[PDB]
């Protein structure tokens, strides 16, 4: 039983609490789209862990690779190159759109964003960073300063030159021009204000193609193109944070491919390492060249370590070989349609959004007032788990609670059906 | 041969340069205190990789453990607990001095320092951070703002409330009271200045017990005790960064044990993961309790992931079981004495310092003027490698180039002898 | 002649240029609504100098008072009180709305705003300051950080916690809700964004009732009431900068009286000193009490000096006795109607706005496209002067050039007519 | 009587308290080196008001000049030049050392320092400002950020890039090299630390030749020369704040003349206006030229107003004509010797320092322990006033209370004797 008093005594006694609450089970094993508790109860992992288990838990190839290098080439002095590092860097260049040539292989998402923000600052000679008011880039210094969905209070001033602009949210529109929600005019309006505040040091804009932590908010048609233009006109770099959207999850290898807009710096992390700590930034030869001329520095312990890189290489290997990107579209459509049927049945579902296998379900009280359902989400979230479905809802100011659904790209048709099943029972049960 | 033109073409074409230069070899394998090149040439790893390979490369137990969990329990939603996390947290409490009770398991050193600085800020309601002018805590935002040995230029303003004080450097003394280098008076003097500048928001002091990147500078007798008092008197937390000094390297399990001063927050990383990306902060129950009351947040992708934690657990397991801490003292003494004999032979060696298996050798021109040897270090560094010895020199303003020596705690007596050998030949050859 | 080569040689050789250009005349004398050049040519001062000559130039009573104290009580140690200081402080309490009780008598407008911002920061324990993107509060540190109409570039980072929101500009509307320019919804929208960026340290909002430098932009009906509510809800003080609007210029003694909204801190300066350097802040007994408890400090050389204070006292004396406030309404109506007749004649006049004797005329090219007239303003401005009328146009991004008209409250009916005359001739001539 | 209950009721009811306490008298008149109370009691003004009454109170020539322009040329639009402005600017160029050519005429000391700091920032393209830990430059934003003797707490973060270094204080030495107080080595030591913290954006150093608020601390021989070199080597401007030292007070027209070191920007204020609000910055033609090219802006209400400028012109006129500079040396010597005789009599006088008519007397308990006399100063200060002598003591951390003595340069021999008399009686009485 998960009721181990010794276990719980120790957790309570010696663990730093870092946000949220700990689930009241002891996870003993993981395999595929499932995690198993102390009792052996299977919990369908509909969030891919912390949205990282792209190939699901303990993928046989991952296991082989890990063991493979665990005992061959593990960690090295950061000035030393090895084959998995060069092969991974080469692959990343090869699969990203034209204009992205060179990579830096790191350990975490926040770290990847910090490396990119630092590079943007060096190269422009400027320092003000612009992000979305609903963004999430990490907990570390720069990454945090650019995070507005949470964490900005009680911890001192943010980085000097921190600005946010509102993200375009079609479900809950707030800017109109002739009865219509003009998200492009809003963008213009937002930048005018920025221009007036700036000290003349705009260095970059950082963005998620789809704001996950933010509420599964997809940037609408033509927006990214418009944003890049705004950056271009001001001498700013565009940094795209694809921690959650990269590596096939949305149906394209990279979210920026769908829009056809290639950023100046691309960051990857969660999906790339497939549960392991690996991250990266990819930039153009030109930007890297200037950063170099200028003495760019981002020297860490694990930068360019062979093991994680070797892991990243195999992950891309199987995503491509198993056509997991297309898969994401087909399973996504199946999962998406199911959610819509649920929305046909329950008035508590106000919106179903997202792309590929990065979906969101926004819970409301009045499916006309679009009033956030106070506590209903937590209840639902609660019943799912009883029911054996791991979910994750996010609650932000002014919106309804949002369920973030992101199962492994390896998820089965039966597994998708299971989740839909359980979700309905959880709903009817929580109401 | 390491001369693979394809390999080198790809590195050049697709790798972001991040500091320093890449060694001109292709590392194919690693095992024990050695790394092997494309030709199979063995290079004695005298820096333990990036100072992380505590049990040396590909330790059989590490390999077992990694495989062991790679296919059992890998990555999880951050709200889910598992046994390796709780066992590791418990162990850390158990082996650290009294007053350190709760741990947060992360991925990188910089991340560990950020988590601690953030917590210190939350708990005090303040934000100014004090570090050493020769410090090194990482490349990320907060960690960088507190790093003064390098990286502060061309990348915009530092974090608001950033101050440094000079570190006590006995080799190159700069503060005197009655003909004597009074490092305590210097400390008093440094704090008076701080007091005058502060906005009344001093939150914490962050320090390395031994400044590695800084030049292998050991805080002299009674200093840490004096510093903690200075912090105590001002309502500041003391954060000790033991990324390089923790896990037995200096001869005690933790460097703070030797002085007998226990910090408010302890950070670990490099040595803890043994080449893998794992890091941690340990704090007191009281501080964690207040952080909690206050809504502390440090929620990341890999926080509390079982695999790395399981790795950390085994590392501590073998350090204790194989008495690697004592070992560090005995091999250190052997390595230390050898360096002293070299210093008997060569006038270019001005100082041999450090503790246990964290040693430094400062190169000079006039062993009386203590004038930094311009380029001699690089030459030496160069000859070592030809000779088959991986070394690392650090060059800071106003000091001589310093070799940072830190071989695995598993290093053999013969391996230590080998290194000394090669080092002398490299010296006589570079002069 | 103004052509004095010696004079011009010296100006060129020894004057620091501080913005704009120097008029090419030598002003020898001033009296009433006129300034006289080297040739004796009378220039009708339609801007009251730098918008300060409230009683016009060299008012007989001002002259008496100045002489009167120049030789009786001049300057004192700042800890010493005298009668004019106490009488002025008492008067200010007496003529401001209920809720404003205590005054601090200073020297400049920027200084007055700094004193208020500092007090707001002390009292709230917070530091982020919110202003209008088209604001003008001064050139000094804090006052500058809160100024967005200009001066933010090439001079380093602004004060930490600096935010701006768009000012409601009815002529050039930019926020709509059902075909209508909803300036209140815009206000709501602006504050939501603020909320998301803030570090939880909002201290105050600073505003001009009518943005002078900004383009003679009057806050529309119900706005100030809404803004104060926004401040109230967030624990922020409302600071009203009436440097240009105070002392009767707009038709009420203080602009805040018209709206009926009394700020937490009121600042005055330009009009108060009537050309002389005197300024003030007035706050509530409660706020002053807390500032005191907390050790408020704003100790300067001229704070509480009798001479300027004695000047300020007489200025209020004659404004009240001569009913200059009502006068402002009657002469304003006359001046206003004239401007409207001009706008009937010339398509280049797109808007006539303002209140009392604080009027603005916005120049455009297409009185339908409302396109800013490129250079026409400068031409007009140029012809006026030839014609003998001192005017002042302000050119801001996205708007047409705006003439800021503000003649002495003592201006005559004939003088108003003269100005209108000259203005038409200048127009017909510049086209 | 000063006991006017109505007066005191009003002061209490309507005055903002701004630091210190209000003297319990009502100053009715001033003339020469005296201020008179409600009862007609003469108080010898030994601080020249707030250290501004250079020609003493209500100087006949000042009175004439003020009246003279009060009714001729008063205040003007800031783009308009007049003769007193050009004559004053010309004079300043003419009497300052070679290398100072152009002036900007403002209203306050803080404003003058802000104008200079802003200009330094524009011209260097940098922003970090370095000052003395015991400095006093004003209460406004930038000026405050550079002030370390007080006011840094409870009012939010200082300006980004604010650093201080210790001022050389010979009475209380703290840095030694071979038993000797090496203030130059201290300076070197201070700059090394600065170098390590800086973000590579050092713009200027701001300093008082003699720190008044700081405790009458005179920069020792060769220091300024060394400091300018430190600035020169780093591309920093040297800003000299002579608010208290300028216009003859120290025995030379400007304090920087004695050392022979001419700063890049010179600021003046207190003494210049002789009690009235006038201030200035003087810079080199080259610096002004670059500031201009770059769009320097420091446009205020009273910049270039004829009245104050006309006042400043007459002040310089009589200082030169009456040889008040030499006078300062002769009366200073008389005042200085007297203080030394007092120090012969009382063990409570630990030090007599300063230059010309800018003197300081540091009170101690143990004239061997040099222990600050706790409360004795306030008592003395108290008895002086009873006795009819206005004094001003400053109490800073780690030093004894310091009396700041600065009587008008017009002070009489009898007046100096009177003060010495009263001071001794006050001492013997307060002990
Ligand atoms: C005391 C200390 N603290 C933190 C760090 C940063 O850890 P990461 O590089 O894993 O984030 C280092 C290492 N610094 C490097 C070095 O060896 O110089 C890797 C660069 C460290 O030594
Ligand atoms: C777009 C994006 N960028 C960076 C990160 C931070 O990565 P790390 O947590 O590994 O540093 C997240 C994750 N954020 C969390 C979430 O799922 O809410 C883990 C907290 C991310 O989504
Ligand atoms: C060197 C120096 N620089 C600037 C100033 C500020 O000038 P203002 O007070 O007129 O703005 C002072 C005065 N400071 C005070 C003092 O005598 O302590 C008036 C407070 C000054 O001494
Ligand atoms: C609302 C408001 N607040 C403060 C100030 C600054 O006052 P000072 O210039 O006397 O310090 C102005 C004036 N600004 C100027 C203008 O007319 O544009 C003089 C420049 C002001 O209008
Ligand atoms: K590495
Ligand atoms: K996790
Ligand atoms: K005063
Ligand atoms: K003026
Ligand atoms: Na590519
Ligand atoms: Na412990
Ligand atoms: Na009132
Ligand atoms: Na000169």
**Cβ–Cβ gap C80/D122 under 8 Å:** no
Whether residue A4 is contained in a domain is answered as no
Contacts of C149 (CB under 8 A, 6+ apart): C133, C134, C135, C136, C211, C213, C214, C396
Query: What are the b/e assignments for D257-280, b being 16+ CB within 10 Å?
Result: bbbebbbbbbbbbbbbbbbbbbbb
Range of the domain at A387: 27-58+323-431
| Partner residue opposite A141 with nearest CB, options B80, B142, B201 | B142
CA distance D116 to chain C (A): 11
Task: Judge residue C179's burial from the number of C-beta atoms within 10 Å of its C-beta, 0-12 exposed, 13-18 middle, 19 or more buried.
Answer: exposed
**Cβ–Cβ gap C196/A398 under 8 Å:** no
Way the structure was solved? X-ray
Task: Judge residue A144's burial from the number of C-beta atoms within 10 Å of its C-beta, 0-12 exposed, 13-18 middle, 19 or more buried.
Answer: buried
Task: Judge residue A413's burial from the number of C-beta atoms within 10 Å of its C-beta, 0-12 exposed, 13-18 middle, 19 or more buried.
Answer: exposed
Q: Ligand 4 in contact with D299 (CB < 6 A)?
A: yes
Answer whether B369 touches A (CB < 8 Å).
no
Whether residue D297 is contained in a domain is answered as yes
- Distance from C-alpha of C142 to C-alpha of C160, rounded to nearest angstrom: 10
Distance B16 CA to ligand 5 centre (A): 14
CB of A63 closer than 8 Å to CB of B70: yes
Among D264, D295, D322, give the residue marking a domain's end: D322
Q: From residue B337, give the alpha-carbon distance in Å to each of B334, B340, B356.
A: 5, 5, 12
- Distance from C-alpha of B377 to C-alpha of D103, rounded to nearest angstrom: 54
The ligand with the least distance to the CA atom of C150 is: 4
Using an 8 Å CB-CB cutoff, list chain C residues near A126. Answer: none
Residues D194 and D166 in one domain: yes
Q: By C-alpha distance, which of C338, C407, C414 is closest to C52?
A: C407
Which residue's CA is the nearest one to ligand 1's atom 15? A300
Question: Which structure tokens are listed for B192?
Answer: 């008076």
Q: Ligand 1 in contact with B244 (CB < 6 A)?
A: yes
Whether residue B370 is contained in a domain is answered as yes
Which run of H or E residues covers position A12?
helix A5-14
Q: DSSP labels for A21-84?
A: ---SS-EEEEEBTEEEETT--EEEETTHHHHT-TT-BT-HHHHHHHHHHHTT-----TT---HH
Residues C277 and C194 in one domain: yes
Mutation test residue for ligand 1: of B244, B254, B272, the one with most atoms within 8 Å of CB: B244
Residues D106 and D185 in one domain: yes
Mutation test residue for ligand 3: of D54, D244, D277, the one with most atoms within 8 Å of CB: D244
* Helix, strand or coil, per DSSP, at residue A317: helix
**Cβ–Cβ gap C75/D82 under 8 Å:** no
**Cβ–Cβ gap C153/A200 under 8 Å:** yes
- Distance from C-alpha of B277 to C-alpha of B275, rounded to nearest angstrom: 7
| Partner residue opposite D161 with nearest CB, options B133, B157, B166 | B157
Q: By C-alpha distance, which of B70, B207, B223 is closest to B136?
A: B207
For chain A, positions 282-301, list CB contacts with chain B under 8 A. Answer: 283, 285, 288, 291-292, 294-301
Q: From residue D294, give the alpha-carbon distance in Å to each of A128, C154, C397, D151, D290.
A: 21, 8, 19, 33, 6
Q: Ligand 1 in contact with B208 (CB < 6 A)?
A: yes
Q: By C-alpha distance, which of B343, B341, B361 is closest to B353?
A: B361
Residues C378 and C263 in one domain: no
Listed resolution, Å: 2.0
| Partner residue opposite C166 with nearest CB, options A148, A193, A198 | A193
Residues A161 and A247 in one domain: yes
Residues C146 and C266 in one domain: yes
Answer whether D130 touches C (CB < 8 Å).
no
User: Quick check: is B230 catalytic?
Assistant: no
Chains touching chain C at 3 or more Cβ pairs under 8 angstroms? A, D
CATH (domain of B429): 3.90.1150.10
Residues D31 and D164 in one domain: no
Mutation test residue for ligand 1: of B19, B51, B145, B213, the one with most atoms within 8 Å of CB: B213
**Cβ–Cβ gap D50/C76 under 8 Å:** yes
Q: Ligand 4 in contact with C278 (CB < 6 A)?
A: no
Residue D177 has phi, psi (to 5 degrees) of -140, 110
Using an 8 Å CB-CB cutoff, list chain D residues near B161. Answer: 157
Q: Which of D3, D5, D7, D14 to mutate to probe the C interface, most C CBs <10 Å? A: D14
Task: Give the residue ranges of DSSP H helices in C254-387.
Answer: 255-259, 270-273, 285-293, 306-321, 324-345, 376-387
CA distance C124 to chain D (A): 9
CB of D406 closer than 8 Å to CB of D244: yes
Distance B72 CA to ligand 5 centre (A): 27
Whether residue A18 is contained in a domain is answered as no
**Count of pairs with CB atoms under 8 A, one residue in B, one in D:** 78
| Partner residue opposite C176 with nearest CB, options A158, A176, A397 | A176
CA distance B133 to chain A (A): 18
Distance D254 CA to ligand 8 centre (A): 27
Atom of ligand 4 at shortest range from CA of C143: 4
Q: DSSP labels for D304-320?
A: T-HHHHHHHHHHHHHHH
Which run of H or E residues covers position B217?
strand B217-218
How many domains is chain D partitioned into structurally?
Answer: 2
- Distance from C-alpha of A159 to C-alpha of A143, rounded to nearest angstrom: 10
CB of C144 closer than 8 Å to CB of C136: no
Atom of ligand 4 at shortest range from CA of C213: 18
**Cβ–Cβ gap A157/C160 under 8 Å:** yes
Residues C287 and C180 in one domain: yes
* Exposure on the CB side of residue D38, measured as CA atoms within 13 A: 15
CB of C107 closer than 8 Å to CB of D275: no
Question: Which structure tokens are listed for A189?
Answer: 């309006």
* Helix, strand or coil, per DSSP, at residue C278: coil
Distance A395 CA to ligand 4 centre (A): 45
Contacts of D390 (CB under 8 A, 6+ apart): C77, D35, D43, D44, D45, D46, D47, D384
Residues D224 and D292 in one domain: yes
Which run of H or E residues covers position A206?
strand A202-207
Torsion of Cα atoms, B281 then D196 then D267 then D31, to 10°: 60
Residue D425 has phi, psi (to 5 degrees) of -65, -35
Residues B239 and B315 in one domain: yes
The ligand with the least distance to the CA atom of A282 is: 9
CATH (domain of D305): 3.40.640.10
Among A274, A297, A322, give the residue marking a domain's end: A322
Name C334's bridge partners: none
**Cβ–Cβ gap B158/D398 under 8 Å:** no
Answer whether A72 touches C (CB < 8 Å).
no
How far does CA C428 lie from the centroid of its chain? 30
CB of B279 closer than 8 Å to CB of B288: no
Residues A36 and A158 in one domain: no
What's the distance, Cα to Cα, between the start and end of chain A in Å?
A: 29
**Cβ–Cβ gap D156/C203 under 8 Å:** yes
Distance A149 CA to ligand 2 centre (A): 12
Whether residue C9 is contained in a domain is answered as no
Whether residue D13 is contained in a domain is answered as no
- Distance from C-alpha of D364 to C-alpha of D362, rounded to nearest angstrom: 7
Q: Ligand 4 in contact with C110 (CB < 6 A)?
A: yes
Answer whether C139 touches D (CB < 8 Å).
yes
Whether residue D10 is contained in a domain is answered as no
The ligand with the least distance to the CA atom of B249 is: 1
- Distance from C-alpha of A244 to C-alpha of A259, rounded to nearest angstrom: 16
CB of A249 closer than 8 Å to CB of A52: no
Among D295, D322, D349, give the residue marking a domain's end: D322
**Count of pairs with CB atoms under 8 A, one residue in A, one in C:** 78
- Distance from C-alpha of B206 to C-alpha of B118, rounded to nearest angstrom: 12
Which residue is associated with the tokens 């002891």? A26
- Distance from C-alpha of B7 to C-alpha of D335, rounded to nearest angstrom: 84
Using an 8 Å CB-CB cutoff, list chain D residues near B121. Answer: none
- Distance from C-alpha of A176 to C-alpha of A224, rounded to nearest angstrom: 19
The ligand with the least distance to the CA atom of D99 is: 12
Q: By C-alpha distance, which of C12, C16, C44 is closest to C31?
A: C44
CA distance B156 to chain D (A): 7
Which run of H or E residues covers position D321?
helix D306-321
Torsion of Cα atoms, A331 then A337 then A338 then A343, to 10°: 150
Residues D289 and D329 in one domain: no
Question: Which structure tokens are listed for C101?
Answer: 């009780």
What's the 3-state SS for D111-141?
A: HHHHHHHHHHHHHHCCCEEEEECCCCCCCCH
- Distance from C-alpha of D244 to C-alpha of D246, rounded to nearest angstrom: 6
């Amino acid at each position: 039983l998960n009721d181990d008093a010794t276990f719980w005594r120790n957790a309570r006694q010696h663990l730093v609490r870092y946000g949220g609450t700990f689930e009241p089970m002891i996870i003993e094993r993981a395999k595929g789209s499932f995690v198993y508790d102390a009792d052996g109860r299977a919990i369908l992992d509909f969030t891919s862990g912390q949205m990282s288990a792209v190939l699901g838990h303990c993928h046989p190839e991952i296991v082989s690779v890990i063991g493979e290098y665990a005992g061959k080439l593990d960690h090295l002095f950061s000035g030393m190159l090895s084959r998995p590092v060069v092969d991974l860097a080469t692959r990343l260049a090869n699969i990203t759109p034209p204009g992205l040539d060179r990579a830096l292989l790191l350990s975490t998402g926040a770290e990847s964003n910090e490396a990119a923000i630092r590079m943007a600052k060096l190269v422009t000679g400027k320092y003000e960073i612009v992000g979305f008011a609903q963004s999430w880039h990490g907990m570390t210094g720069a990454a945090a300063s650019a995070t507005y969905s949470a964490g900005r209070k009680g911890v001192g001033p943010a980085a000097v030159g921190s600005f946010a602009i509102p993200a375009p949210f079609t479900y809950r529109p707030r800017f109109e021009r002739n009865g219509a929600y003009d998200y492009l005019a809003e963008l213009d309006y937002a930048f005018d204000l920025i221009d007036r505040q700036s000290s003349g040091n705009l260095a970059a804009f950082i963005a998620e193609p789809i704001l996950s932590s933010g509420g599964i908010i997809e940037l609408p048609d033509g927006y990214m193109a418009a944003l890049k233009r705004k950056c271009e006109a001001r001498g700013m770099l565009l940094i795209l944070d694809e921690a959650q959207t990269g590596v096939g999850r949305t149906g394209t290898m990279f979210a920026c491919q769908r829009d056809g807009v290639t950023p100046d710096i691309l960051t990857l992390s969660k999906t790339l390492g497939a549960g392991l700590p690996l991250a990266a930034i990819v930039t153009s030869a030109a930007i890297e060249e200037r950063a170099h001329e200028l003495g760019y520095l981002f020297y860490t312990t694990h930068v360019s370590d062979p093991l994680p890189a070797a892991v990243g290489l195999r992950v891309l290997d199987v995503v491509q070989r198993d056509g997991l990107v297309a898969r994401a579209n087909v399973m996504g459509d199946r999962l998406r349609r199911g959610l819509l049927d649920l929305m046909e049945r329950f008035d508590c579902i106000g919106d179903v959004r997202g792309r590929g296998l990065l979906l969101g379900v926004e819970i409301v009280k009045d499916r006309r007032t679009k009033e956030p359902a106070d506590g209903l989400g937590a209840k639902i979230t609660r019943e799912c788990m009883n029911l054996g479905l791991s979910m994750n809802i996010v609650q932000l100011p002014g919106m309804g609670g949002v369920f973030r659904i992101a199962p492994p790209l390896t998820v089965s048709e039966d597994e998708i059906d299971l989740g839909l099943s359980l979700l309905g029972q959880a709903i009817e049960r929580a109401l």
